[PDB]
C-alpha cells in the first residue's frame, strides 16, 4: 500500500500484513518485442518487484518466475500557453516472466473492422 | 534583449486536423428537435 | 583567451554552495530564504 | 491621433437622489444650534485631516502624528522618506529666498 505508514519492525516483530491494497496496476502491450513468456505491467512507483510477485500470485493466482523493473522518465519539454513546462508523470515498468512454461500474448482488443447540365439554378422550380 | 516566441494560438478543425486528435463522440444531453 | 564559459557545471558543488542545507547553516543564510519566501519565489534555493 | 468610432453610452445623473437633494443640511448647526457643535465636526475623512488643512509637507507630518504608530513597515518607510524629500525641497530649493 502507498501513502500509508508501515509499522517500524524490530527483531522478533510480527509479520507485516496489508488487508486492503492501495496498489492498482495495468497490463500494457509491449513497445519492443518480448519473449512470449514475458508480460509488461505499469505499476505505482512505490511498488517493489517483490510486491508485484505476491500481488499477482495471491490476487490473480498467476505463477511468476522472475520480475524486472525500471523507472521511465516522463517528458518535461512541452510548454503551456504561458510558456510553463508541462510534466508527464514518471512511471515504473515491470517485466514479468511467467512460470511453468506458461505463455501469454496481449489480446487484440478493439477487433472492430445536381445536374451538370443546369448548374446554379435551383431544381425545386418546375417552371 | 528580446520578446518571447508565443505561438499565439473554422480554426479548431485545422488545429486538430494537423495535430490529429481523438474526438470521442458525445451524447447530446438535450435531444435535437 | 575566449571568455564566457566561466560556468563548469557540477551538481555536488552546486548543492554544497547554494543548497537548502547550506543556506540554513548560518543565520544570514536563513534570512536569504526569508526574503525569498516573502517575495513569493517559487525556488527558495537550488 | 485616433478617436472613438462610436458614441460612448449615455451618462445619466439623477439630480434628486437623497445625497444630492439633502446636500448642505446641518451646515449652520452652530449658529442655528447655539454652538453646541462646530460644522467641522460634520466632516468625514482621514483622522489626521478633519477640520484641518496644510501643504504636502504639513500633511505628511500630521498623518505620522495621528496614525504613525499603527502604520505598516513599508508605508512608514515611504512616509518617512517623503517627509525628508519635502523638507529638503521647501527649505533649500526654489526661486525665492
Amino acid at each position: 500500500a502507498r501513502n500509508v505508514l508501515y509499522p517500524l519492525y524490530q527483531l522478533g516483530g510480527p509479520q507485516l500484513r496489508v488487508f486492503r491494497t492501495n496498489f492498482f496496476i495495468q497490463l500494457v502491450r509491449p513497445g519492443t518485442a518480448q519473449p512470449e513468456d514475458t508480460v509488461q505491467f505499469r505499476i505505482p512507483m512505490e511498488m517493489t518487484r517483490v510486491d508485484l510477485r505476491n500481488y499477482l500470485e495471491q490476487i490473480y493466482n498467476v505463477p511468476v518466475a522472475a520480475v524486472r523493473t525500471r523507472v521511465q522518465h516522463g517528458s518535461n519539454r512541452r510548454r503551456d500557453h504561458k510558456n510553463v513546462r508541462i510534466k508527464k508523470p514518471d512511471y515504473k515498468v515491470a517485466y514479468v516472466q511467467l512460470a511453468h512454461g506458461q505463455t501469454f500474448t496481449f489480446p487484440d482488443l478493439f477487433p472492430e473492422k445536381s445536374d451538370l447540365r443546369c448548374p446554379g439554378i435551383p431544381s425545386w422550380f418546375g417552371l | 534583449r528580446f520578446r518571447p516566441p508565443t505561438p499565439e494560438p473554422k480554426e479548431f478543425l485545422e488545429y486538430a486536423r494537423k495535430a490529429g486528435l481523438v474526438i470521442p463522440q458525445e451524447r447530446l444531453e438535450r435531444p435535437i428537435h | 583567451r575566449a571568455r564566457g564559459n566561466e560556468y563548469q557545471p557540477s551538481n555536488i558543488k552546486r548543492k554544497h554552495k547554494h543548497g537548502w542545507v547550506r543556506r540554513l547553516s548560518t543565520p544570514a543564510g536563513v534570512q536569504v530564504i526569508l526574503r525569498r519566501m516573502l517575495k513569493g519565489r517559487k525556488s527558495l534555493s537550488h | 491621433a485616433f478617436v472613438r468610432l462610436t458614441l460612448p453610452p449615455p451618462k445619466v445623473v439623477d439630480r434628486w437622489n437623497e445625497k444630492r437633494a439633502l446636500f448642505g443640511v446641518y451646515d449652520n448647526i452652530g449658529i442655528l444650534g447655539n454652538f453646541e457643535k462646530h460644522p467641522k465636526e460634520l466632516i468625514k475623512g482621514p483622522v489626521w485631516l478633519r477640520g484641518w488643512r496644510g501643504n504636502e509637507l504639513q500633511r505628511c507630518v500630521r498623518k505620522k502624528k495621528f496614525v504613525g504608530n499603527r502604520m505598516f513597515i513599508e508605508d512608514l518607510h515611504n512616509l518617512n522618506k517623503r517627509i525628508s524629500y519635502l523638507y529638503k525641497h521647501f527649505n533649500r530649493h526654489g526661486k525665492y529666498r
Partner: protein, 88 residues
C-alpha cells in the same frame, strides 16, 4: 544480458607460450544463489537442470574455442580437428 566495452581476451587458462595447451576436464561449483532450494522457492523448479546445462555450454564452448585459436584456427580458417573437452 547487458553490453559493455572492455578488453577482448582469448585465454585457455595459460598463455600461448605454455606447453600445456589442451584441456582435459573442468570442475564447476554452482553458487548458492542458484542452488536447488532457492530455485524451487522462486517457482522456477523446471530451471534446476537448466542451470547446469547453461554453465556447461558456455564454460566448455569458451574453453574448447580458446584452445582452437591457440592452434591458429579462427572463423576464416575453420578447425580441421574437432576440439574436445568435458566438465562436471
Amino acid at each position: 544480458l547487458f553490453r559493455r566495452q572492455y578488453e577482448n581476451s582469448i585465454f585457455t587458462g595459460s598463455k600461448t607460450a605454455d606447453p600445456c595447451c589442451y584441456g582435459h576436464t573442468q570442475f564447476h561449483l554452482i553458487p548458492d544463489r542458484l542452488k536447488r532450494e532457492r530455485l524451487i522457492r522462486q517457482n522456477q523448479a523446471e530451471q534446476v537442470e537448466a542451470v547446469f546445462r547453461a554453465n556447461a555450454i558456455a564454460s566448455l564452448f569458451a574453453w574448447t574455442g580458446a584452445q582452437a585459436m591457440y592452434q591458429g584456427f579462427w572463423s576464416e580458417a575453420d578447425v580441421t580437428r574437432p576440439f574436445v573437452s568435458q566438465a562436471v
